């Protein structure tokens, strides 16, 4: 069900260089498709540009691995 | 559906050191669970012991990644 998909999303995101955990993930079904919004932790000393790059890389990785996701927004917050 | 799960099984198996493609995969639902049997290609010059190790590693990798699989047999054949 949903929990299995959420596990996969978290595991996929964590394997992306520069992710320091998944801080938040909201996933919902729109029909058979998942729409999700996520916040990742990142090094506080990364630049804003780097954090944007990490978010883009997470979006690509997660959407590539979990084919039912049809919308994924990823934002970042500083995390030790 | 099934095709999405089969894609995941093949992709997981291919990422295991020493797999030279998935030659065969039969997957079936027993209730909500998947039972599967797979043949991987391996280097003809690997030993029988090494081929057994690769099969064990595929079983572990695939079962670890695809939680609905409750039975997976993996065998090997020589592949160029």
UniProtKB/Swiss-Prot annotation, chains A, B:
The shown chain, on whole-protein numbering, covers: 215 to 292 of 318
Coiled-coil regions, chain positions: none
> Changing residue 48 to R: reported impact?
Loss of magnetic response, still stabilizes MamB, CTD dimerizes, binds cations, dimer interface is tighter and twisted
- Native source species: Magnetospirillum gryphiswaldense (strain DSM 6361 / JCM 21280 / NBRC 15271 / MSR-1)
Encoding gene, per UniProt annotation: mamM
Expression is induced as follows: Part of the probable 17 gene mamAB operon.
Question: Where on this chain does Fe cation 3 bind?
Answer: 77
Residues recorded as binding Fe cation 1, renumbered to this chain, are 37, 73
Family per similarity comment: Belongs to the cation diffusion facilitator (CDF) transporter (TC 2.A.4) family.
Can you say what this protein is called?
A: Magnetosome protein MamM
Q: What is the effect of changing residue 38 to P?
A: Severely impaired magnetic response, cells make very few, small magnetite particles, less MamB and MamM protein accumulate. CTD no longer dimerizes, CTD has cannot fold properly and is unstable
Return the annotated region ranges for C-terminal domain (CTD). 3-80
> Changing residue 37 to A: what effect?
Slightly decreased wild-type magnetic response, fewer, slightly smaller magnetite crystals. Significantly decreased magnetic response, many fewer, smaller crystals in vivo, isolated CTD does not bind cations
């Amino acid at each position: 069900h949903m929990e299995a998909v959420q596990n996969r999303i978290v595991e996929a995101a964590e394997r992306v260089p520069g992710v320091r955990g998944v801080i938040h993930l909201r996933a919902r079904y729109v029909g058979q498709d998942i729409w999700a919004d996520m916040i990742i932790g990142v090094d506080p000393e990364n630049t804003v540009e780097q954090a944007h790059e990490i978010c883009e890389a997470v979006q690509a990785a997660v959407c590539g691995k979990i084919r039912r996701i049809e919308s994924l927004d990823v934002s970042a917050e500083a995390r030790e």
